[PDB]
Design a binder for these strands. Structure first.
Lengths: 186, 50, 130, 184, 83
RNA sequence: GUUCUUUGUAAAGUGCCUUCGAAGAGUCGAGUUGUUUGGGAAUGCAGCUCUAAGUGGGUGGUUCCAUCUAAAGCUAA
RNA sequence: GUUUGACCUCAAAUCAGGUAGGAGUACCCGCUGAACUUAAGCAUAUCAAUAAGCGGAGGAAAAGAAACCAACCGGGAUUGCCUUAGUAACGGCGAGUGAAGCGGCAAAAGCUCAAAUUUGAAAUCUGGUACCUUCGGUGCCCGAGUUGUAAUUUGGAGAGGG
């Protein structure tokens, strides 16, 4: 194919080709708006393996976020990527945030390219592989951390290590902090 | 040598079956009468727009 | 309450639904043989052992041929297209039974099919004909 | 004078394209096939336009209107998707692979000239993705390949290979070296 | 008694795959080198593998990282110089 | 239940023989400040520095062994 | 050719068609986040990953088909209940905090993409438009699209032939 050549190309980020590509594009993205729409994905390989199909109803938005946070280390423990996903969720409120990836970074700003599906588009409402997003249980997945990075920041996975946050940390706290009393007292 | 030793399929040598599917779909549409054939389409404009 | 207080005071009327007796006794639907022989006074598992059929394949927690013959009774009890038929007519009339020559022919076997495909399809053609 | 935002951006990007030192896997583009050889490549490539959607529809209704009431060789056309071209190359099914110099993300087609030099596929970086688009019923194509050919066009194709080898690959053996864009 | 179980994914662990070896090495030559690797290949020729692995270990995560990386760079040199 | 349509060298499945055969990177990881956990094993996460490999890689268990396939997505009770 | 024409990017339009906000908020998913108090006076700690604040969903939400647990004669998505169990572990080892595997039971269900050429044929789709048996179908047209929509394939392998 062609995307394996692309995939293994973008794994080298400080390599002289992709160094130059990233040098031009970081400046070019500064000259535009903060949240603006991309004509097409810059990394179509990574877009596609995160589930971007180049068809009507699929949108790529490019987004910018400030970096960082002991007053200057009063932390703010939510990610930069979740902040970005939420902002594009509000400017494009008719869409549904599917996934997002890293494109270019800087001293001040990390950039992302969110991928968005139009659930009202009839090319999405048919085709039984993508019409799950039209179900109203996906209205703002990025606002509730149901995206890839949100599920990471929530700490939702499997095992010993995620026992405090496997069904969600609020749910497990409320469950284990409940005096359960039966009719015939145990 | 080429990178992979993938066996070439029959369809790369045989006449295409997707083409056969489309043809045998239009065939049905002509029997049903919902596609007017290219031969009669001339006759529909030889009688009209005069 | 706030909303319930008004709704119990208004002249609109409540949307009263008396669906409590329907929760216990749901009619059996998927099989008319079972639908005729199901004692509604008995429970689920009692109506299974009455008929004979096993209700739970794992051994339950706790302490626990009249109709199955009728089921056994009702359980003991692809043509070719015009173009495909005419294609096999052409192959048989030109060759006969020489499948090596029949499949190496560029004019009639346009799809480069094997010998087994040809003898199977021709026998389907021969069974439907004389 | 005062220009718009986007006009200023594309003019700034134009001067940025020149004034930076560039890595030699890029600027291996823009060292591209000249006017005569480009016109002669297309004089062959125009004979193999993929059958346009209208032409295919009318012909396959002609098949239906004839064959349902009352042998052909496999037809040859140019091959035009990047997944399909980089499939064809490395399987050595490519005799001439044409690569556009202007691609929206440049990173897409950077491996392709050197993968063609690796496989022994006689490639030519031709100027314009629009110009490749024209011969292929698409707006843009990025890549166009010529696998198989009619025997009338075979000798011309083999000479097109040898002309491109001499004109392109021999004049631009220095292009694998030398970081481009040192223009003062 | 044992029943000789079905094979799994990392039992044929990293199945060779002639094509991906080719693709990784194909991108390796095209992309150039990262600025530290660019220093690392100068450091092998001048100072040797001793200090080269020292810098690589500080740069990367663990020592097993620095093994594979300096050897990778030694194959860059072994191909570029001779063949 | 009754009934109208089904087609096209159409779509599958079983067993054997024969030829091949990829698997998610600013991500894992490492350091680091801060938060957080029952998690002393440094439990999770966030920011910042640096940043991998494919007979890979992760997680456990007294020379090794076992068991998973990450960094993509849906799904009732 | 000092002309004409492809594209690329960026706009506009009371353009055609859509869609987002606000309410409710018990439960549910996030973000943000204290203090009174309790600890011997008390920067850790505790109340508490609580209340308040802000966003986002549904009939449930979330979770979910292992980068899981184990160390067995091995189990096998999640969730929930009894049990583990005030156990392991944390803590001026102080006030105090505090699980999980196993076993029983409730309920159970599995799958889908990206990455290997349809290349004997973009097989795909949206809209406009005229009919019809109208949660749609059919015909024609403008497009989206090869910087990849379809069919095949997902490790339990799988694919091409016989």
């Amino acid at each position: 194919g062609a995307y394996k050549y692309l995939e293994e190309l973008q794994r080298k980020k400080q390599s002289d080709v992709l160094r130059f590509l990233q040098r031009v594009r970081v400046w070019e993205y500064r000259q535009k708006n903060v949240i603006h729409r991309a004509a097409r994905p810059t990394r179509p390989d990574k877009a596609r393996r995160l589930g971007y199909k180049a068809k009507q109803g699929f949108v790529i938005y490019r987004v910018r976020v400030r970096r960082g946070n002991g007053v200057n280390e009063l932390k703010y423990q939510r990610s930069l990527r979740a902040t970005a996903e939420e902002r594009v969720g509000r400017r494009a409120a008719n869409l549904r945030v599917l996934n997002s990836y890293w494109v270019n970074q800087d001293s001040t700003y990390k950039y992302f390219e969110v991928i968005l599906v139009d659930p009202q588009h009839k090319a999405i409402r048919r085709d039984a592989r993508y019409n799950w997003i039209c179900d109203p249980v996906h209205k703002h997945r990025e606002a509730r951390g149901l995206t890839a990075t949100g599920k990471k920041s929530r700490g939702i996975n499997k095992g010993h290590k995620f026992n405090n946050t496997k069904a969600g940390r609020r749910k497990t706290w409320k469950r284990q902090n409940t005096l359960s009393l039966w009719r015939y007292r145990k | 040598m080429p990178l992979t030793a993938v066996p070439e399929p029959k369809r790369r040598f045989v006449p295409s079956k997707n083409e056969a599917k489309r043809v045998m779909k239009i065939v049905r549409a002509i029997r049903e009468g919902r596609i007017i054939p290219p031969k009669k389409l001339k006759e529909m404009k030889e009688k009209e727009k005069i | 309450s706030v909303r319930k207080r008004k709704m119990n005071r208004s002249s609109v009327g409540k949307a009263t639904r008396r669906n409590k007796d329907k929760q216990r006794k749901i009619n059996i639907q998927s099989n008319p043989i079972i639908a005729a022989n199901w004692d509604y006074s008995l429970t689920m598992a009692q109506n299974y052992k009455k008929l004979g059929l096993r209700a739970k394949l794992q051994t339950p927690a706790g302490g626990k041929e009249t109709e199955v013959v009728k089921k056994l009774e009702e359980l003991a009890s692809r043509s070719q297209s015009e173009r495909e038929e005419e294609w096999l007519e052409k192959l048989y009339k030109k060759h006969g039974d020489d499948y090596k020559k029949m499949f190496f022919d560029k004019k009639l076997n346009i799809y480069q099919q094997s010998e087994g495909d040809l003898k199977r399809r021709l026998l389907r053609w021969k069974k439907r004909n004389g | 004078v005062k220009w718009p935002e986007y006009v200023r951006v594309q003019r700034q990007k134009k001067i940025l394209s020149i004034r930076l030192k560039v890595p030699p896997t890029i600027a291996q583009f823009q060292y591209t096939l000249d006017r005569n050889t480009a016109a002669e490549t297309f004089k062959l490539f125009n004979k193999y336009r993929p059958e346009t959607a209208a032409e295919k529809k009318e012909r396959l209704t002609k098949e239906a209107a004839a064959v349902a009431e009352g042998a052909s060789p496999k037809p040859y056309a140019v091959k035009y998707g990047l997944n399909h071209v980089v499939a064809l190359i490395e399987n050595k099914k490519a005799k001439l692979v044409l690569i556009a110099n202007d691609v929206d993300p440049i990173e897409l087609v950077v491996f392709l000239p050197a993968l063609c030099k690796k496989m022994g596929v006689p490639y030519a970086i031709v100027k314009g993705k629009a110009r490749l688009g024209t011969l292929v019923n698409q707006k843009t194509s990025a890549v166009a390949a010529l696998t198989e050919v009619r025997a009338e066009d075979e000798a011309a194709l083999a000479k097109l290979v040898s002309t491109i080898d001499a004109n392109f690959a021999d004049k631009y053996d220095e292009v694998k070296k030398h970081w481009g864009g040192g223009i003062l | 008694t044992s029943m000789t179980p079905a094979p799994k994914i990392s039992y044929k662990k990293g199945a060779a795959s002639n094509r991906t070896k080719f693709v990784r090495s194909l991108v390796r030559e095209i992309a150039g080198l990262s600025p530290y690797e660019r220093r690392l290949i100068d450091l092998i020729r001048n100072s040797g593998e001793k200090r080269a692995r020292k810098v690589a270990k500080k740069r990367l995560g663990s020592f097993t990282r620095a093994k594979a990386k300096v050897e990778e760079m030694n194959n860059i040199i072994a191909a570029s110089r001779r063949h």
